[model samples]
Target: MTEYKLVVVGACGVGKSALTIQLIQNHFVDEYDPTIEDSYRKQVVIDGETCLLDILDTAGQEEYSAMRDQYMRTGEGFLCVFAINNTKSFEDIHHYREQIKRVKDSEDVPMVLVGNKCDLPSRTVDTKQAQDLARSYGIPFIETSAKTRQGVDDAFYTLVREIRKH
Candidate 1:
């Protein structure tokens, strides 16, 4: 069985946990602990490959920055989620990318950029902008909405299928 550690990270309330939950457990959560101070570990099978994956769900806390390194070091790939309607969270993407590199310790790790909450018709970030940003990062990108179950599986399983190619 192939083992892969998958990390998901982003600013608070950016649908990081929600996306993770939907992928791992197949459901969206409306209520959760708002504090950004902890992480989660889960073992999963992707494409029938077994992996003791540490699904790094961080508490967007500066105090937990070191924890980010812990996750990065263990991750085989990443699914980085950002809200489409929030510019500040999008602007803060550098920190997340830096953390991902710090842990993964390599630029070659596979990644997928997720612009979530696309169910909102009044989006501040457009598709072209999202695609451009993802292009700059050299990863696949998708607009997803967990609320309506839109593109949720694609955002996650696409990465899985990509990882499988290795």
Candidate 2:
């Protein structure tokens, strides 16, 4: 089976772990404490092609920032996640992207910008702005709600497809 290393990253409380947990295990988590890294393996068939996904769910804390390079180096693709309700987190996407580019030494790395918590009533970040930012980066942008499990699969599948092309 084909194997791919996928990385999840973003600011704290932005649903990085929640998205991964929902994707791999189909369960939603209310809260997640910061951790160094968590690994999950899942078998999936996309467009009739079967593959194994090895996901690295990294902590969003700045203290763990130093460890990102190691994970970034091993990643085949990434989901740069941010919360829709948190504008600050949305603004930090550039930092995350730059860090990935620096560590991976490639500006055209396969990735998807994920906006989580779309189910929330209050949205601080506009979808158009996020889409425009993603367009500037030349990557796909997707809004997902782990709570309602909306657009969750699209984000992962889209990233996996991009990885396959790369």
**In terms of TM-score, which candidate is strongest?**
2
Deviation of model 1 at 21, angstroms:
1.9
Residues 103-157 of candidate 2: C-alpha lDDT, one tens digit per residue: 9989789999999999999999999999999999999999999999999989999
RMSD of 2: 1.3
**Which regions in candidate 2 have their CA more than 4 angstroms from the true location?**
61-66
Clashing pairs in 2: none
Model 1 residue runs over 4 Å out of place are 36-54
Which candidate tops lDDT?
2
lDDT: worst 10-residue window of model 1: 36-45
TM-score, every prediction: 0.83, 0.95
Residue range with the least summed lDDT across 10 consecutive positions in model 2: 60-69
